[PDB]
Design a protein around this ligand. Structure first.
Ligand code: MG
Ligand code: MG
Ligand code: MG
Lengths: 156, 151, 151, 151, 151, 151
């Protein structure tokens, strides 16, 4: 079933329009680089309504769905894929709590945000949703196949 | 709710250790709005009033003496949940009980040299702001970035 | 003289862009001593007095209108050569001609949005300090770190 | 003039050395506007076109081989004077001769491992942006902070 | 109690990844006093004695082989509660479960590449300091800033 | 030659002011290789040998007394052009005349509290490394990142 390393796990991260308008793109990317995660794909895109609706499909029909979609489509988003052992759960830990005010100092939302509706970043919630979100936001040709030299020091 | 305010003082240890700008930047980066700021050397009267809840406790004199001993950066921050959030950003009362990432967890060791005061509740914040600042020292302004801070 | 002082103002662009703490920290890390600090929204008359040398010039009204358009972090720094050193730390009048590492070089683009004012000479610093601060707003203190900053 | 654009590529050494976010942040903090950004592994045909002015010179093959040897963060920045400003931020051709504070000065040693490319002029930026990005990849947006960046 | 000491090693992964200065700075900024520091490539004998508690366990040979594989920054820090505080600063054994703001949480992924060792108790710290450092390598000094670190 | 080496000393002011990790990180981020490092309180004889070219000048004794007055972080860095590059990173002899971005420009004011020494030439580096380090204190290792640092 499984490959000898789960270090090829991938997650989807979006820096939402608030992150871009607040000048947080490089700061947040650097937190993932310094952790040892590998950047596989990255693009600045203004999402279409279809992409946003499909991204948020689990919330379709709920009262707050339209607001989520309207915000995500309102301006540029930095969409990316990170690879490494445990990356899905680790990125969620790095992001913090859903409510930024309850997020710990040191997390992205704890350091930089206040409101749930302006909470800077999305990360996939599980391996399966990460797989779905990566394929929704990126074609295979956009995924970069490379080998970080530093992995000798990242991975045993 | 987003007009809630809290009082922050960077105590004489913070000023002597060169932490004023570093700490202010943490509140700016979080999205809180700076309403008032000054460097002052608190009088004994101001320090006793600041710590009035502890009147007659054995540790009261030490708190007052330290706060009056040198310059303090006093300020007011505004935003949703700012009183409780500033306490979370500061950390535990005892720096060694405070987490990495908090102000006290990153920068301090001794409870008597714990860098910063933040109000403990909305009511004490209102009292402390009024104690330390005249109304004329409070700046009325609207951050352009609030479009991206607040939904 | 190690007691030289300069006046620094972080203008409304610096405040709106969240640069107050970042900039203060550069002065603290250099070893300069913070003597006074306040957040104030300048009146037109204060701005006209600050920019008195430019009254009559085609850019004067814009300077005054901009300075009064939001809060300003006004402060006084002390140390050897602080007037000229602060100007070096700030950069050129044009941010686009300012070197990386300077405040304007790292953070700004336009002359009219160039973040910070510092006095241009000892005599203008003395004037600007007295204009912006009453004597009782200046803090008298001795940083213990000076043992390691000054020979 | 404030709609000028430049092309920046963070080359395979920048990506392998973990410098992508750090360098992007230097452009964001300066006030330049990110118009487009992607991680791409340049094909031989793209790299040869990028370096076309050097076709036939002894060092051409090495430039193409290095640029195709790993991912590249390719991007477009907009703002007044951005072409020359980015060149100033990058530093000198030789990293060892680049000033502290510049990207090459802070992070690089060898000309052949020079971290970053920026367009050298408006006309070359126009060519490079069109080569590396389809028009559909360029995001049209208005930073609300521009009232504090531009006069 | 303020003269408690702990032993810290930045293991070969920390040195190869360029984290020596970044990590030392976190201990300096907290108020801990650097007593001893050296870059050493541990011998097999030293590494086996360092990990003696694990001798005869299946993972012992791997720990020893890794620690001896390249240079290590070994050091001694002094201050109140330094042993437990350094462990909190380090994080959990698993970097993936270490909180943001900790050294392992910010910088690492794998248990076998977890950057840093800190003594687990006062007694093991005393043993490790004496194992790695002769008494003549310990520096006796008084930080001026301790007026502000300690009450 | 990529194996050129220079001697760097972070003098007692650097250690007292908490700048050890910050400065080491600047050399690491540049791509230079740490060969040796130790915290030592220099003996009077070592300080006199370090400053021997000034013997018989009135300021020799002041230099010696300062260098012995607290711990010193002594180290050896390796890489192409490291002697001249470290001098550029340090800045000018007078900190007030050193550019922002340099170590002395960012952190110092007085020539007599100038934070750091770096060898002035390859020949003096060879002498200084041999004076401050025994050969067995030099670490032989190969950074895996060198394929991205060097062509
Ligand atoms: Mg008039
Ligand atoms: Mg006139
Ligand atoms: Mg060697």
């Amino acid at each position: 079933h499984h490959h000898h390393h789960m270090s090829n796990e991938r997650t989807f991260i979006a820096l939402k329009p608030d992150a871009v308008q607040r000048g947080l793109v490089g700061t947040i990317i650097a937190r993932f680089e310094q952790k040892g995660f590998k950047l596989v794909a990255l693009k600045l895109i203004t999402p279409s309504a279809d992409l946003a609706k499909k991204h948020y499909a689990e919330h379709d029909g709920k009262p707050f769905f339209n607001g989520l979609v309207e915000f995500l489509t309102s301006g540029p988003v930095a969409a990316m894929v990170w690879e490494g052992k445990g990356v899905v759960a680790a990125a969620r830990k790095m992001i913090g709590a859903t409510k930024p005010l309850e997020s710990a100092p040191g997390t992205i939302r704890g350091d930089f945000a206040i409101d749930v509706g302006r909470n800077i970043i999305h990360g996939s919630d599980a391996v399966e949703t990460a797989q779905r979100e990566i394929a929704l936001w990126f074609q295979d040709s956009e995924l970069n196949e490379w080998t970080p030299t530093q992995n000798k020091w990242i991975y045993e």
